[PDB]
Write a protein that binds this ligand. Structure first.
Ligand SMILES: Nc1ncnc2c1ncn2[C@@H]1O[C@H](COP(=O)(O)O)[C@@H](O)[C@H]1O
Ligand SMILES: Nc1ncnc2c1ncn2[C@@H]1O[C@H](COP(=O)(O)O)[C@@H](O)[C@H]1O
Ligand SMILES: Nc1ncnc2c1ncn2[C@@H]1O[C@H](COP(=O)(O)O)[C@@H](O)[C@H]1O
Ligand SMILES: Nc1ncnc2c1ncn2[C@@H]1O[C@H](COP(=O)(O)O)[C@@H](O)[C@H]1O
Ligand SMILES: Nc1ncnc2c1ncn2[C@@H]1O[C@H](COP(=O)(O)O)[C@@H](O)[C@H]1O
Ligand SMILES: Nc1ncnc2c1ncn2[C@@H]1O[C@H](COP(=O)(O)O)[C@@H](O)[C@H]1O
Ligand SMILES: Nc1ncnc2c1ncn2[C@@H]1O[C@H](COP(=O)(O)O)[C@@H](O)[C@H]1O
Ligand SMILES: Nc1ncnc2c1ncn2[C@@H]1O[C@H](COP(=O)(O)O)[C@@H](O)[C@H]1O
Ligand SMILES: Nc1ncnc2c1ncn2[C@@H]1O[C@H](COP(=O)(O)O)[C@@H](O)[C@H]1O
Ligand SMILES: Nc1ncnc2c1ncn2[C@@H]1O[C@H](COP(=O)(O)O)[C@@H](O)[C@H]1O
Ligand SMILES: [Cl-]
Ligand SMILES: [Cl-]
Ligand SMILES: [Cl-]
Ligand SMILES: [Cl-]
Ligand SMILES: [Cl-]
Ligand SMILES: [Cl-]
Ligand SMILES: [Cl-]
Ligand SMILES: [Cl-]
Ligand SMILES: [Cl-]
Ligand SMILES: [Cl-]
Lengths: 355, 355, 355, 355, 355
């Protein structure tokens, strides 16, 4: 519901000489806040007791807004402190969750870097799949029901398993049921897709509305538990175990792609951006990630995407091999965001980057 | 056939005040061209439509030479543009392939960084094995025929499989045949070697003919599809699949070796360089890679080598842990190459580095 | 036995205008010595023939003290050269081993960065376990005997295997016996613990006695042979092999943790430091590492620790994502150590950092 | 009157996680505020309409406190805003004047970098002369009355002229009287001293109470109007003019001293600092300037001093030849001040640097 | 008398892994020693009590060799310490004076950066004038005797005055005699030359024997006492004084030349270098200064030169406008010298730079 004009008029009461960058202390905020300082900004960190130490010891925040629980960040009281500080908020995974995506879309009256509307399109698998399919991107083959399974599939519930047949599907669902991990309602909405066998590249892009350009900033591969620990056990020993794989994100590892695949990499970002302009105007604004798998035919297949900054940007907080090429600098995504905020304030084009 | 004097006399007609660095837009050209700019050079990128975006958006090339297909880079027309631009060409994997190694050796009349003759020694498994064996380096044990198999082996055809017996060899060859991946002629020339079980270090060295020194620049491990995706599937599920491993390079991951192994690391490069001087004068010039596996006895076994810059240098385009030690700089291999070109022009010793 | 006053009075005869940093040429000495140079120090490297090349080519040492074998570094002759050079010695894994931990504790009369006494607490599994348990840290569940095994365990002998039952334990012990890898005396003291299935984070901390603060410097995951090569073999092929896993450290790979887990990360270091002050005064001084595994419940379980600089700091010799946040610099652990030595000399507080 | 305990207890109610650096927008505030940002601080600038542009366009201040006139900076309202911002104030020439030195000494209840008491000793020519004389420094010879004049003298009134005799003194005083530049009361308190003929070095020092050390940061020579414009007129033309010299500071020019004179330079700062400890405890804190003239006998004679930061530090806001030697950095005095504030907060020694 | 082979054979007994840079603590040693550290060298400073503080507080020397008086630096004892430290000595104005130029030429058996023989050519006005005249450089017109004076001249004695006639010459000589500044023997050897009226540029060049190139590093103007203080007194007041000008170097001020005059600037260095090769082989090595005055016809007239590093390089110890152009670095002359020492050691060409 929140209007653009409604947000531009909040920002107009802002002291344009004292624009700060704010965010929630979690997810990717260390380089969001570091990147801001490096660009000249004073920074605001929403934090809480027991969770504030990393931001205090890394010296990355100038002002703290302590909440009782991160859930309070929807409260109109915190919105006020943020407006009085002239903060532009940089959204990220954790902020959207603790604030709630409905509160974000029509109850959070603080200026926000990026296209506010499009945060819904990453939250819903149908919108996400619609976008990736319509943008012309390779995605895993989808399966309507367990009876349609004719290969190895992975099965996700909004807590994960692999199946190579209809029969294996139910045996495994049953296991995860009689172990108190999945209720009958989760499996009633099981999402089944082709298991893509390949190398993980989570590709971090930045779309600049100022330059009208998609940029490559970096790449990581996920480090997930228990799976990346499960597959480190020798095959003979794994068979002696009664252990199911889980896919809980615990961290990230840096990777570079084969250089001949960069034309495919940019075309993917270009296409995604050209379609999102049509479907959710103005489209992708700033940081976005295609989480893909590269098969043996050197084709990147995208199984996920983010419409804002992705946790994997943490793997290059001191810059990376791709962020370096632009200007020989240790450039993070956080700093690339802050720079866009800076240039837009200087060119009087803040309307291209906030909502 | 191309003579050294034949190349020195092409370079003598060069305007020594305007020496550019050229390369093909692929493989490792992003840091070759970035590294050149950082050293003061103007840069030339051979590119083509649909494949030029990465070089335009990374702002790494000053002049583009567009070809219809990269195969045209042998054409005497492109050789002329390069000579008129006073370009020294930096060779790499992709350039040699698209240009053709015979065209490189006697039909490509543009000055080239490195020892031109020695590019043949990396192309032929017999020359390569000859060199590594004569340099005194550990290599996988070789097997003349499937009947000689007495352990786990890996089998390569100039598309890969593992066997632990003669019987398994044929069963697998048959599979890859009746699946249209290998013709009877490929398996007629199957290369069988010991499967080395260990940690991958692709070690990137630079030999300076100016300093008469082998330098350590960095290290990566390969990220290959489908294999690195295959082994991420739990053992129980893998057994339910009918899937063969492939070993297609898709990218790279940074790694550092145990420091006590660096004396072995340098001795390997020293030895390789001392033997290549004898076998293919003047020997190794500039960048070279030993692709090795470290067994549990802390011995590096080399299964491959490159006689020019290797794709893994991309993992440290913003510098790495070893390239940093020299001068505290974000030094890439591309920039280390450009620096040698610079120093040689300044010391009037271009004859030590081109051919 | 070596007293603090005994060491302060050695250091008092030091020319305070010419303080050098010394260490043994191995383990982590490349960034210890590089970091020192960067902070203004002249550096001393204990090295030997055949093992000195890495330090000569990286140009990281100003003065060499050549020994016949690294075992000689206990010799009172080498202690004298070090005292005459005004060297503070930075201890590390290799130095303690070659010098011998008893010689370190009462026969090595050279000033040393860190708490000398506490190097014993990392050497003994009982002290180490005592400390981690009393500090309140999660550790693997321990097993008194093979008959207590009720899950997957890993078994270590001061050369490793996994067991999922009492029966499997003996079958495997027998195998490693009848293969000449373990004598009956090793298995008589077998250390059996819970096999933690998860993602490896070796977390590198620095405790500053000057700032009274625990800092996060970086993180790596181990790269071990043959295990990380064993699990890269497809499950079907592994079953055709008669191969046991080994866990020999060969190198390291960079990783970042999920940012929401940093509060747990710092609390772990804080707790460890607060307990070590009580148990071994003054406690942890400078660099320390918690080597942990993150399970699917996002809990870090510590299976090992170091009470000095850990080999994994090599993964960020050119700085890392966390070391960057402080001041936007390529900061290594080696340089963080040297800086503390520098600040302490400038503030006349060398008594807070040496022993 | 303002007590130290009275100031420590104001600072104790400060949020130690959000310490800002404040100052008045004038004099030397550009590098005071720039230097602060570079050290990680958020900055507060006291400014006013018509005088705020330089600080807005140089992007050097995060928060502005607008006053009606700089005279309002004594007002208890502005003191409150400063306390609520957790600001340490950095004093300078302009701040003391607009605030009034009595208000500074007992009516300005905001923490302040430096020794508050000693700002009186630079304001009074008797205290200043007492200090320089007792510290053992060369100063111009003083003259009790016009009748004591036996050489070339310069005559100052708290607007300047040169005399070489008693007679010339009165003729000139009369001129400046019958021209409405000096009243009979100014000349009733005329300060007459030896005219020192030599080269101007305004030497900028920093005393660190943390390191107990006097540091050399830089040097400038004054650029004064109309005098430096008067002496640029050829002698023949000057004689055709009826023009008196004035000595109004308009700017500064960088200079380096002859290196053999640096031992004299440091001894002067050392001596000044050792005497000020006795006379006005704790003595000199942070930045101080000896404004001297070097005669042909290579002796520096001091005609003025500042007990805080001097305007000449502006000549090296991007660092200078001496500030560079420490760490190869573009270090300004402003940044050297901010660093001391930083280190003191980190070492819990804020009591050594504020009052 | 000292031979080159005699010096090469001293240097051959040097540990080539531990080459240090040494110099006397005075003149230009701050950037000589800083520049060395920046290039990776350990540094040796010859100093003495009462004169060592600047080098201790600037942290620029790793090892001190204390002498009783700087005159002792000729002593064979100090030569030994320097040889045992593997020091290459960098000569400068003060070192040559305290050591004595005869001792330098045949009694100082330590390797020395530059052409040892040519230090005599800067010491003798006849050799100096011979060189500048034969190199084809503009110099002041010379006058054989006071009776030849037909314009404004300046008169120098190996303490200075200006004369516009024969009569004025004697009146002034008489004054300086009856004031005890000049004996009858000084004026018996008075050197009289054209007074050049113009702007002072002391131009600092570096000749690289490695690159065979003359480089422009920077420029300063002298700051001399009492003269630059004398001319700051208004003309009317100067006439009321009985004061003679002196020209004692006290410091330096940075200046840049008009860019259209750089072709003249380089040709002057080129010419000087081409003639010095013939007259004193191998010629100019490393740093040299032409001290010139630019007349209204935009012609640089050289009144002095140095055959080693000149004191004016101190004006750009943090780099300057010209030293910046090469690589965008804060490059001093001291660091440019150290770099040449570094490159020569790396290229095995130390024979091009020492003697
Ligand atoms: N289509 C797929 N094929 C193979 N692995 C997948 C697929 N989708 C997800 N995964 C793995 O499951 C993890 C969690 O996926 P998601 O919850 O979709 O982000 C991913 O990071 C992948 O490692
Ligand atoms: N390092 C990371 N890599 C990838 N995804 C992440 C990372 N950190 C957080 N996320 C995602 O963002 C969500 C919120 O993060 P958290 O607050 O850490 O639970 C998680 O559910 C993850 O899907
Ligand atoms: N001797 C070997 N033992 C084990 N793995 C190998 C061996 N040779 C090659 N490989 C794997 O196969 C991939 C392709 O090898 P190549 O085609 O020889 O460069 C390598 O990157 C290795 O990961
Ligand atoms: N990132 C890389 N790592 C290792 N080898 C590579 C890499 N990129 C390319 N290569 C090798 O160079 C050849 C040509 O590269 P491409 O043009 O990308 O196919 C390939 O066949 C690979 O063997
Ligand atoms: N409790 C455990 N659970 C699983 N793996 C372990 C455990 N302890 C050690 N390891 C693995 O064995 C290697 C050697 O362990 P350690 O010798 O205890 O340092 C470690 O780096 C781990 O990869
Ligand atoms: N890169 C590394 N990562 C982790 N641990 C290491 C590393 N290097 C050495 N160590 C440990 O330090 C000990 C001595 O090292 P080394 O002298 O290399 O054998 C080894 O036994 C290892 O446990
Ligand atoms: N004793 C002196 N001899 C010569 N010039 C002076 C003397 N004192 C002050 N001046 C000049 O007058 C200017 C103003 O001096 P003051 O007002 O004392 O700071 C100084 O910057 C000097 O250039
Ligand atoms: N650039 C400068 N150099 C030397 N002294 C200065 C400078 N700027 C200001 N001052 C002194 O500080 C006082 C206050 O400065 P202002 O507010 O600029 O008048 C002046 O009376 C000067 O004596
Ligand atoms: N020919 C000349 N004409 C005018 N001024 C000169 C001349 N030679 C020397 N001077 C001045 O006298 C100072 C001392 O000169 P010198 O002792 O020759 O280095 C120089 O720095 C000049 O400022
Ligand atoms: N800063 C400087 N500028 C020009 N010449 C200098 C400088 N410092 C020293 N010299 C010359 O070098 C000689 C020795 O310097 P000193 O030991 O400082 O007397 C002096 O006689 C000067 O001629
Ligand atoms: Cl992203
Ligand atoms: Cl995310
Ligand atoms: Cl390479
Ligand atoms: Cl390659
Ligand atoms: Cl550590
Ligand atoms: Cl270790
Ligand atoms: Cl000052
Ligand atoms: Cl001032
Ligand atoms: Cl010079
Ligand atoms: Cl000089």
């Amino acid at each position: 519901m929140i209007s653009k004009d409604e947000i531009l008029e909040i920002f107009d009461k802002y002291n344009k000489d004292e624009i700060t960058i704010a965010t929630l202390g979690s997810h990717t905020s260390l380089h969001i806040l570091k990147g801001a300082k490096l660009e000249g900004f004073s920074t605001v960190c929403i934090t809480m007791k027991g969770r504030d130490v990393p931001y205090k010891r890394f010296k990355v925040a100038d002002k703290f807004i302590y909440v009782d629980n991160f859930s309070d960040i929807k409260n109109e009281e915190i919105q006020e402190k943020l407006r009085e500080l002239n903060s532009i908020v940089v959204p990220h995974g954790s902020f959207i969750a603790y604030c709630g995506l409905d509160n974000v879309e029509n109850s959070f009256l603080v200026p926000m870097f990026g296209n506010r509307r499009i945060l819904r399109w990453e939250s819903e698998r149908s919108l996400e799949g619609k976008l990736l399919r319509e943008a012309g991107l390779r995605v895993p083959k989808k399966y309507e029901s367990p009876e349609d399974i004719d290969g190895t599939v992975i099965v996700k519930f909004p807590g994960y398993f692999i199946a190579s047949s209809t029969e294996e599907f139910y045996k495994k669902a049953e296991d995860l049921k009689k172990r108190g991990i999945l209720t009958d309602e989760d499996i009633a909405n099981a999402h089944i897709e082709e298991y893509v066998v390949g190398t993980n590249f989570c590709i971090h892009y930045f779309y600049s509305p100022l330059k009208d350009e998609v940029e490559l900033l970096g790449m990581d591969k996920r480090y997930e538990s228990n799976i990346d620990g499960l597959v480190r056990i020798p095959a003979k020993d794994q068979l002696e175990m009664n252990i199911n794989p889980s896919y809980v994100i615990t961290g990230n590892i840096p990777v570079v792609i084969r250089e001949s695949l960069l034309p495919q990499v940019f075309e993917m970002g270009d296409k995604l951006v050209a379609k999102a302009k049509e479907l959710v105007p103005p489209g992708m604004i700033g940081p976005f990630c295609l989480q893909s798998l590269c098969n043996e035919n050197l084709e990147l297949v995208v199984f996920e995407m983010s419409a804002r900054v992705d946790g994997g940007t943490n793997s290059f907080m001191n810059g990376g091999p791709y962020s370096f090429l632009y200007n020989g600098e240790p450039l993070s995504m956080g700093q690339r965001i802050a720079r866009e905020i800076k240039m837009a304030l200087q060119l009087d084009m803040i309307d291209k980057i906030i909502s």
